[PDB]
Amino acid sequence: FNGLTGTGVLTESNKKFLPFQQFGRDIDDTTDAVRDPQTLEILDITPCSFGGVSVITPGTNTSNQVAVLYQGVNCTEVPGSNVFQTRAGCLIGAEHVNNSYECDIPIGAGICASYQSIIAYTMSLGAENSVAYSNNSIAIPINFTISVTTEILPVSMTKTSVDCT
């Protein structure tokens, strides 16, 4: 548009340009809206989407199926299998269920996939139980067990020396 060159997606907008103004701007000097010099209309500008891909795999030892998660893209312009639209991107190759299991491959925003066929669902924090609180009752143990645990703590690392010359 009239000298300035760029790449983006043009959309109809609703700004209030002053008559002598030609093109808008953002806080960080990044062009935001432009007035087209044919009909004097405002056009908003949105950068073309990007975002790293990721692969979700259950381990080669089990099987050779994977599910591909694209990060932060509206899952309409992605291009095979079931296409799931979530709040962290979109999943391709993973079917969606209506349950809640404690999960093991967290992908984000509360969604976390796992092997069965590779399903994707919502976390379940724990088994929801209620203690029968009454104002004149207690619960005293009558037996005990003794348990042994472990803890592993590093204390030092390798010593190295490098000569500059």
């Binding site: 989407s49 790293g52 990060q71 932060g72 509206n74 509360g110 924090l125 088994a127 203690v131 619960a139």
Partner: protein
Amino acid sequence: MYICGDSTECSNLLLQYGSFCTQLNRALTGIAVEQDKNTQEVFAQVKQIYKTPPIKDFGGFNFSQILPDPSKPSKRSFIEDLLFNKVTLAARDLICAQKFNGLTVLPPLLTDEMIAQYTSALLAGTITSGWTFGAGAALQIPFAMQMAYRFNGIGVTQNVLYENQKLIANQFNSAIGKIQDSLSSTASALGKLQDVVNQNAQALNTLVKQLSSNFGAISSVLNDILARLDPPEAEVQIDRLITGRLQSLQTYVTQQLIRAAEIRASANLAATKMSECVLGQ
């Protein structure tokens, strides 16, 4: 994308400097997984999700301003809502966090409502069963006797509670209402969180701002320089810009490493406090 900006000759010039991008991305990914581990170890201290009894007769104490309510959709309590409204500086305005220059904000693993469920579980457990839910399985015990056991641990005999139950209940209710009002009215009480947010935002802003400097070249945009001169002798300016932007990127990454270290120390302290002062005495 940040350094070059979709130009083949810039990529050809850049690919010969080694593998800087590899360790940069590795460092950032390390920081992100550390943040997730921080939150997980701070909050998830319990295995089940205890639920408060429908009838509330806690010996005269009044907890209605801490326990969650069903009318609100987010199932957050009253104090949590005061604290969420006070931090001014995500509905549907999402999947739009990317900027024109390559940089993205990933979403947290634990949604806000899950953290609300965690804290509700912790607080209902400690109201009903005392500290015994941190050792084994929860064992119910009426609130008055739990309070007598908690006096008896600071050297005050337990006669003192049962003849002064009303005074203590009234003082607790008044104190909780007073803290509610003080938090609602007075501002500038949440210093630490707001300072953290401001520091992160300012670092990002200066990183973006650094992108528009000559660095000793002809101009600040690659397209003009590459389209004005000849490829035999227009490579020196490209080299200068590449070196400058690499330097700025390294500076930013190092600052993030330092800040992540201090936040990790603070998270460890919070975990210790939450394990020793809530789940016991």
